Amino acid sequence: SKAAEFVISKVDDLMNWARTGSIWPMTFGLACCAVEMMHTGAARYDLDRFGIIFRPSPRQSDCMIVAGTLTNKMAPALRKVYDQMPEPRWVISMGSCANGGGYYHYSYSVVRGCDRIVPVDIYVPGCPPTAEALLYGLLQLQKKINRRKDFLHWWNK
Amino acid sequence: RSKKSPMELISEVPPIKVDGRIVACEGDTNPALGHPIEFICLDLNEPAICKYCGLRYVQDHH
Amino acid sequence: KVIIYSPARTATQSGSGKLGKWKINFVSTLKWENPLMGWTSTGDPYANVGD
Amino acid sequence: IGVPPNSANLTEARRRVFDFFRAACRSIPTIMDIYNLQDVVAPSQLRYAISAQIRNNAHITDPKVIDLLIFKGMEELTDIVDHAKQRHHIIGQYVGKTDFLKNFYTSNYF
Amino acid sequence: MDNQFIFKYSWETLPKKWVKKMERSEHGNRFDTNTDYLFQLLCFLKLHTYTRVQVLIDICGVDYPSRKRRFEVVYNLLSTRYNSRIRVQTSADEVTRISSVVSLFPSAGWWEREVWDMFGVSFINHPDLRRILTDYGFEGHPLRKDFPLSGYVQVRYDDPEKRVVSEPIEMTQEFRYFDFASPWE
Amino acid sequence: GVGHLARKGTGGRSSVSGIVATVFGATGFLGRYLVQQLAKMGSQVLVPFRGSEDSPRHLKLMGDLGQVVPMKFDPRDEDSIKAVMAKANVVINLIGREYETRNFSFEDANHHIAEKLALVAKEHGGIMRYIQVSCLGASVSSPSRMLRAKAAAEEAVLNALPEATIMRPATMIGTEDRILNPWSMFVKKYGFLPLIGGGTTKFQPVYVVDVAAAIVAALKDDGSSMGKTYELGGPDVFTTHELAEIMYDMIREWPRYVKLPFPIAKAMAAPRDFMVNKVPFPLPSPQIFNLDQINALTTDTLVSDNALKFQDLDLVPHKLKGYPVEFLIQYR
Amino acid sequence: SNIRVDSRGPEVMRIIPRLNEDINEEWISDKTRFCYDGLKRQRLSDPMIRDSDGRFKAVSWRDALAVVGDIIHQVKPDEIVGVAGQLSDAESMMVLKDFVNRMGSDNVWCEGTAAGVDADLRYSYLMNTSISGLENADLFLLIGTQPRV
Amino acid sequence: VVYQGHHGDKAVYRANVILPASAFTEKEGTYENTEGFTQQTVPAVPTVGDARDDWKIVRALSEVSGVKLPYNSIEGVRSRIKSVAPNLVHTDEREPAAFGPSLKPECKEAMSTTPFQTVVENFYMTNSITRASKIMAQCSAVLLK
Amino acid sequence: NFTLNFGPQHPAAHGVLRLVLEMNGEVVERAEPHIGLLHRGTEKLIEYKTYLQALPYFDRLDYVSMMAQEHAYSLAVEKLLNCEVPLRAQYIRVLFCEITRILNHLLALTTHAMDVGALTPFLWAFEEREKLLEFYERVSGARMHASFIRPGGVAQDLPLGLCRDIDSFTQQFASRIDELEEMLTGNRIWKQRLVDIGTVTAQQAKDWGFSGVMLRGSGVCWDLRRAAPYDVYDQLDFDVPVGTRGDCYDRYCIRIEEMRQSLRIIVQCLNQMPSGMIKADDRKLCPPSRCRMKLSMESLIHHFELYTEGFSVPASSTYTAVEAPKGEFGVFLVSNGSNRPYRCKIRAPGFAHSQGLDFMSKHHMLADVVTIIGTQDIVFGEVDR
Ligand SMILES: NC(=O)C1=CN([C@@H]2O[C@H](COP(=O)(O)OP(=O)(O)OC[C@H]3O[C@@H](n4cnc5c(N)ncnc54)[C@H](OP(=O)(O)O)[C@@H]3O)[C@@H](O)[C@H]2O)C=CC1
Ligand SMILES: CCCCCCCCCCCC(=O)SCCNC(=O)CCNC(=O)[C@H](O)C(C)(C)COP(=O)(O)O
Ligand code: SF4
Ligand SMILES: [Zn+2]
Structure with missing residues (x-):
């Protein structure tokens, strides 16, 4: 196993580098947090520097950012959007309304967070999160991706 | 350090010596950055504990 | 099953400014403790409507 | 079309109730066609379910209340017929010793 | 064109039995009718030359669970050329049909539905x-x-069925209602 | 087996029950129903997973802020397995693959691991209940390969813990089953549905939520569950032919078959696909031609007429015609 | 005496007197005012059955109820005495009385000082003069009562 | 003995089957005053553990023992009381007594000599609730001789 | 006429907008927007929180003109309380409302242009909007949602080094506006994609309740801050741009001129800034100074009873109205006399603008509907409350 370990480690490193160097988040903006989320990608912070080009449809995007409150009527639409994405499906809960209840958290027509649906990998807190906070959340997601031994697990099994 | 709980950490601070009969405690040296001013009448044989700060005051002599 | 009553004046304070008002008291006595943070949970929507 | 004025008397509301039941029965193939349910249920006992729900509230005498139930039923019917309600909800709504000992064993508050 | 002039004019010009009661104050001029002469009152207030109320701002709604006529819908109006505001309101009921005013102001079509919804x-x-x-x-x-x-x-x-299903409410931490009400007020 | 329920409030997602059950191998097909059933009644469930950290990801939606807490465990290692149980009182076993990799042979797929967890639960001293799960029809004398080792495991587990319940589902049917979905996928590709059994192979398919209800009911009821071994079975007896018609009528396609005898299929299935003998560990998985299954379809899988039944706990099986089988609309 | 229980969540925090001119007259006793602590201390939570070997384990509601239903008929129709409690409400005592009487037995009595007392006229065991009516009296003849403890 | 309560105090030490019962802050029952005034109780707080109302417990025990009772709800048992003491279901009524010491079983029997004896010794420890409290335990140590 | 389902799940059409519509193949007949996907439920939640706790609700509604939204609530509470606010607070409130107007106009213009397709001025204008969000960061705690304005005055005093930065920004903001305008007004494509689109007559605007830029894009000189001036606006000198034709191009020109006038008003407010206190003093609805509540008894009592109970507004009801960047924003407060509002309806200017979309897209192209959505500047926080 040690003889064929360098190759699998290199393959894992290459896949992790490829997946971290090009993440295509899907702008699923819903509320005021979408303003800060499109404002991160402006000329001052240049979200595109990290290969974070946005996508218009969930078919090509491999990540999605839930920016804004999630009411009851939009919950099925969010679930359908999440289902259509390809296999990886990394999800980021931007804002304080999306990552668990929120400032409302009590009204009749509000889902108490986007964790009742669409299981989340990174929680970005703030109302609204600063552009640097969203950048830090994306960096944390990239760090999360680097821990995936995709080939080693499939080769050990 | 963090092994000592604050309750067991304030007790080791030596009590303050006051010449007068009442001493006003304001928290920090700057009045605006501490607790509201508290006048404590220290007359017993035991130190008078500031209810906000936890600081103790002992009267030495008039 | 509800109870219609006028809340009494609190003993600790001598003012009678909260009197003369009637309330419906839904008996929402079902509350428990969340076993992670000690928060009080409810399953009855009328927990504080009448209050 | 536009919302009719409230019925003056009960006999004028009764024909409105019959018209609403008539429309519900007329539109009943559409629900079975657009929601893809054929083996789970047959259209005949949906008639029984609608009749039961319309006869349960048969003791109301006030014409205004009856008119309001007709209004709300029309809104629910239009929600179901149009692509507003979502699957597995229509079928959710539609289609021993003693009770006291069971209620005692399950909980204090019954 | 100010509060007092409009008060005099609508006290004289308006036919009686329409306005059940009226108020004049700095907060706003009110015309409380009797939930049946609403279309007529709005039509008169829209077409008359000395009261050219053209735009309906919003249709409010207040729930008073202590009076026989539980609800109370409020019609906010505005006269652009006279630069004045009139607030006409009625008293509604939970089982009763109050007349609509979509014919006069087409903008009311959505506040109408919102008042029905809320x-x-x-x-x-x-x-x-x-x-x-x-x-x-x-x-x-x-x-x-x-x-x-x-x-x-x-x-x-x-997960048993891949869809989002509603369920009875069951909250982790109940809404803490703080009763700050005090006497001497 | 009493004094471990500890009910707190109404039946809900955030309610409380005194169950800290750890469901081993919950990342598969039965696990996503068993965990949901456990979490629906407020029981806290722990899911020890060994694959990627994104495999037990859909299971976080079962509970509510800490009901589902997966941990990583190494099957080869032993004392790290104790970590995912040191704070538990109920242990459920679902491990076992229909495949065969070199690293985990048939014996070390659902027998060695089951014995290890049974022994470490016995020496734990706190594991109140145990529900091991095997397949229906497992026996020492059977042409089926894994079923023999599975039966050996299910008889060896009782020695370590006599008060252990054994469940025997039979060809579970669900949205992600391995016996009906592959047939539909193959039909979509080109479509002939090779019947290895050639029909006349009547068994008892069951729907997965009924199985999960069976385990959760064996946990709920206080009495004849420890030691007893149930045999969960469907409402009626189904063969591979009429099952083929009841799946074809929903795909909306002409029912065509290439029904063939046993030995040609067995020769094209086992030796052709058996190549886990040298160099690499991962090999492509069998779709329909499974080494164990080809031998398993030579005998009926009827529920024992004298052992425990599925209605012993008062559960009516789901009638497998119109309600359970509804995922096939995605194919039509 | 009328009280006003104040509770935060599932536990009682404090007890505050409620005004009732006839019964307590806006005051409240120490025993009834600071007894809210006992409602959260050692309390019976689940049914418990003594074992054969002297151990005392906890079971479900059905099991203990099944045991008591087994032993209910192991005794003669006589000698099924049931003693009511000091705090038990009227409904509990009524149902206990009905349950005992419907099994050929009558030995139900209130806890303490109920040996041979007859209570049939509703004035030989009640405060016939109202509590508020004691303000019109001119002399008291307390007979072994000590209305302070 | 089949004990049924919400505390211990020397009855648990002898009990054979223990059935938990609700407290007075978590049940709705009618209590009678010394002057014959009755008044109900409001369920302030939830019950602790798997405990049920006393009347529910005895009704279920009656059913399981095999003897039938004609009531199954808290309203029904109240109607049963109406035939045994209809003043017990008149909450806000200041009913007086309609009799006197005239009619009674006049029985001049033998006298006694033993003096009257105190029936409560410690005021702060009377019922189980006050016996298990901590405030009362330290209160009945410095407030009395 | 077949029906297709719009409703994209991205802010590239402002998000949260179903908009089912009828199609003849190339010309839309009736468009039915399905609002309610963002009905968070503020109006019900207002009644459960005191007059101070309810202020942050108003920042969330129409979440691009933040301080222009809580300003209406503050004015309504002041009117219900007969509270007099000092002059310096009025001037800084006007300044920050003008900053909100500039932010809203920039965001609306660039979002609409990016909907059309022009994507380069978008990033230029967000580069310029950085400088004003930084100003918001300075005075208050947060960049976007700033609870700066309170019923009494403003929450905290301005920092020392703020007016210099604001004037330095205003020195070049006009040139930045000229740069953004030269790319669109003089362009050819912009004219053919906007002129004679979504024309509304003055009678139609009045009937459908289009107070704001839509009303002023039809020739109606109805400016609420000039017709009914609330804060110190009589002292300030500015013009009200009024369009001639109700097409989308004149609305764009009106918005550009509104940005110009807002810059002028900011300059005037910077010049004419008096000294004095910021919070009111007549009534007790303002917190005591934190250097004062720590040595005074009455001040500490006021702090306690204000940060727990809040001020009790005497029982009355009124409808205030301010000139939000979108249009007329009004708050209908009903006071029970207690410390919580009985009913607080929020008149969102975008609600009427969104309902009036059906007749605006009458016999237009389908891609001609996104430009109509952009030109009316709809955010769905206010539309669904
Ligand atoms: N439900 C059915 O249709 C039938 C069920 N059964 C029995 O029920 C059991 C569960 O059914 P099913 O849910 O289909 O099984 P799974 O499909 O869930 O596979 C079991 C899981 O256990 C884990 N696992 C497998 N081998 C190992 C190993 N060597 N070490 C550690 N973890 C391992 C895998 O998780 P990962 O892949 O993430 O490692 C796998 O997903 C089966 O094992 C079988 O014995 C019997 C007949 C049919
Ligand atoms: C799939 C379809 C979707 C919609 C399904 C329907 C959903 C809403 C159903 C409506 C619910 C209601 O209660 S709305 C209808 C309720 N209204 C009434 O029941 C009228 C009162 N009853 C009478 O008038 C008479 O008794 C009568 C029984 C009519 C005959 O007796 P006669 O001849 O002597 O008059
Ligand atoms: S977190 Fe704050 S800014 Fe974001 S959607 Fe929620 S309330 Fe709006
Ligand atoms: Zn101090």
Whole structure:
């Protein structure tokens, strides 16, 4: 196993580098947090520097950012959007309304967070999160991706 | 350090010596950055504990 | 099953400014403790409507 | 079309109730066609379910209340017929010793 | 064109038995009619030359669960050329049909539906009166003082069937109602 | 087996029950129903997973803020397995693959691991209940390969813990089953549905939520569950032919078959696909031609007429015609 | 005496007197005012059955109820005496009385000082003069009562 | 003995089957005053553990023992009381007594000599609730001789 | 006429907008927007929180003109309380409302242009909007949602080094506006994609309640801050741009001129800034100074009873109205006399603008509907409350 370990480690490193160097988040903006989320990608912070080009449809995007409150009527639409994405499906809960209840958290027509649906990998807190906070959340997601031994697990099994 | 709980950490601070009969405690040296001013009448044989700060005051002599 | 009553004046304070008002008291006595943070949970929507 | 004025008397509301039941029965193939349910249920006992729900509230005498139930039923019917309600909800709504000992064993508050 | 002139004019010009009561104050001029002479009152206030009230700002709604006529819908108006505001309001009921004013001001078509949605006061000769704000399968009227804040149904995703299904409400931490009310006021 | 329920409030997602059950191998097909059933009644469930950290990801939606807490465990290692149980009182076993990799042979797929967890639960001293799960029809004398080792495991587990319940589902049917979905996928590709059994192979398919209800009911009821071994079975007896018609009528396609005898299929299935003998560990998985299954379809899988039944706990099986089988619309 | 229980969540925090001119007259006793602590201390939570070997384990509601239903008929129709409690409400005592009487037995009595007392006229065991009516009296003849403890 | 309560105090030490019972802050029952005034109780707080109302417990025990009772709800048992003491279901009524010491079983029997004896010794420890409290335990140590 | 389902799940059409519509193949007949996907439920939640706790609700509504939204609530509470606010607070409130107007106009213009397709001025204008969000960061705690304005005055005093930065920004903001305008007004494509689109007559605007830019894009000189001036606006000198034709191009020109006038008003407010206190003093609805509540008894009592109970507004009801960047924003407060509002309806200017979309897209192209959505500047926080 040690003889064929360098190759699998290199393959894992290459896949992790490829997946971290090009993440295509899907702008699923819903509320005021979408303003800060499109404002991160402006000329001052240049979200595109990290290969974070946005996508218009969930078919090509491999990540999605839930920016804004999630009411009851939009919950099925969010679930359908999440289902259509390809296999990886990394999800980021931007804002304080999306990552668990929120400032409302009590009204009749509000889902108490986007964790009742669409299981989340990174929680970005703030109302609204600063552009640097969203950048830090994306960096944390990239760090999360680097821990995936995709080939080693499939080769050990 | 963090092994000592604050309750067991304030007790080791030596009590303050006051010449007068009442001493006003304001928290920090700057009045605006501490607790509201508290006048404590220290007359017993035991130190008078500031209810906000936890600081103790002992009267030495008039 | 509800109870219609006028809340009494609190003993600790001598003012009678909260009197003369009637309330419906839904008996929402079902509350428990969340076993992670000690928060009080409810399953009855009328927990504080009448209050 | 536009919302009719409230019925003056009960006999004028009764024909409105019959018209609403008539429309519900007329539109009943559409629900079975657009929601893809054929083996789970047959259209005949949906008639029984609608009749039961319309006869349960048969003791109301006030014409205004009856008119309001007709209004709300029309809104629910239009929600179901149009692509507003979502699957597995229509079928959710539609289609021993003693009770006291069971209620005692399950909980204090019954 | 100011508060007092309009008060005099609408006290003289308006036919009686229309305005049940009226007020004049700095907060706003009110014309409380009797839930039947509403279309007539608005039509007169819209077409008359000395009161050219053209734009309907909004259609409010207040739930008083202590009076016989539980609800009270409020019509906010505005005269652009006279630069003045008139606030006409009625008294409604939970089972009663109050007349609609979509014919005069077409903008009312959506506040009409919103008032139906929030409170439950139905309207006559209105093209749609469909729910506009709440969920499609929503039940009850939320802005009523009866409706609990948390609501009656929760929403969550269950894996046994790949869809989002509603369920009875069950909250982790209840809404803490702080009773700050004190006497001497 | 009493004094471990500890009910707190109404039946809900955030309610409380005194169950800290750890469901081993819950990342598969039965696990996503068993965990959901456990979490629906407020029981806290722990999911020890060994694959990627994104495999037990859909299971976080079952509970509510800490009901589902997966941990990583190494099957080869032993004392790290104790970590995912040191704070538990109920242990459920679902491990076992229909495949065969070199690293985990048939014996070390659902027998060695089951014995290890049974022994470490016995020496734990706190594991109140145990529900091991095997397949229906497992026996020492059977042409089926894994079923023999599975039966050996299910008889060896009782020695370590006599008060252990054994469940025997039979060809579970669900949205992600391995016996009906592959047939539909193959039909979509080109479509002939090779019947290895050639029909006349009547068994008892069951729907997965009924099985999960069976385990959760065996946990709920206080009495004849420890030691007893149930045999969960469907409402009626189904063969591979009429099952083929009841799946074809929903795909909306002409029912065509290439029904063939046993030995040609067995020769094209086992030796052709058996190549886990040298160099690499991962090999492509069998779709329909399974080494164990080809031998398993030579005998009926009827529920024992004298052992425990599925209605012993008062559960009516789901009638497998119109309600359970509804995922096939995605194919039509 | 009328009280006003104040509770935060599932536990009682404090007890505050409620005004009732006839019964307590806006005051409240120490025993009834600071007894809210006992409602959260050692309390019976689940049914418990003594074992054969002297151990005392906890079971479900059905099991203990099944045991008591087994032993209910192991005794003669006589000698099924059931003693009511000091705090038990009227409904509990009524149902206990009905249950005992419907099994050929009558030995139900209130806890303490109920040996041979007859209570049939509703004035030989009640405060016939109202509590508020004691303000019109001119002399008291307390007979072994000590209305302070 | 089949004990049924919400505390211990020397009855648990002898009990054979223990059935938990609700407290007075978590049940709705009618209590009678010394002057014959009756009044109900409001369920302030939830019950602790798997405990049920006393009347529910005895009704279920009656059913399981095999003897039938004609009531199954808290309203029904109240109607049963109406035939045994209809003043017990008149909450806000200041009913006086309609008799006197005239009619009674006049029985001049033998006298006694033993003096009257105190029936309560410690005021702060009377019922189980006050016996298990901590405030009362330290209160009945410095407030009395 | 077949029906297709719009409703994209991205902010590239402002998000949260179903908009089912009728199609003849190339010309839309009736468009039915399905609002309610963002009905968070503020109006029900207002009644459960005191007059101070309810202020942050108003920042969330129409979440691009933040301080222009809580300003209406503050004015309504002041009117219900007969509270007099000092002059310096009025001037800084006007300044920050003008900053909100500039932010809203920039965001609306660039979002609409990016909907059309022009994507380069978008990033230029967000580069310029950085400088004003930084100003918001300075005075208050947060960049976007700033609870700066309170019923009494403003929450905290301005920092020392703020006016210099604001004037330095205003020195070049006009040139930045010229740069953004030269790319669109003089362009050819912009004219053919906007002129004679979504024309509304003055009678139609009045009937459908289009107070704001839509009303002023039809020739109606109805400016609420000039017709009914609330804060110190009579002292300030500015012009009200009024369009001639109700097409989308004149609305764009009106918005550009509104940005110009807002810059002028900011300059005037910077010049004419008096000294004095910021919070009111007549009534007790303002917190005591934190250097004062720590040595005074009455001040500490006021702090306690204000940060727990809040001020009790005497029982009355009124409808205030301010000139939000979108249009007329009004708050209908009903006071029970207690410390919580009985009923607080929020008149969102975008609600009427969104309902009036059906007749605006009458016999237009389908891609001609996104430009109509952009030109009316709809955010769905206010539309669904
Ligand atoms: N439900 C059915 O249709 C039938 C069920 N059964 C029995 O029920 C059991 C569960 O059914 P099913 O849910 O289909 O099984 P799974 O499909 O869930 O596979 C079991 C899981 O256990 C884990 N696992 C497998 N081998 C090992 C190993 N060597 N070490 C550690 N973890 C391992 C895998 O998780 P990962 O892949 O993430 O490692 C796998 O997903 C089966 O094992 C079988 O014995 C019997 C007949 C049919
Ligand atoms: C799939 C379809 C979707 C919609 C399904 C329907 C959903 C809403 C159903 C409506 C719910 C209601 O209660 S709305 C209808 C309720 N209204 C009434 O029941 C009228 C009162 N009853 C009478 O008038 C008479 O008794 C009568 C029984 C009519 C006959 O007896 P006669 O001849 O002597 O008059
Ligand atoms: S977190 Fe704050 S800014 Fe974001 S959607 Fe929620 S309330 Fe709006
Ligand atoms: Zn101090």
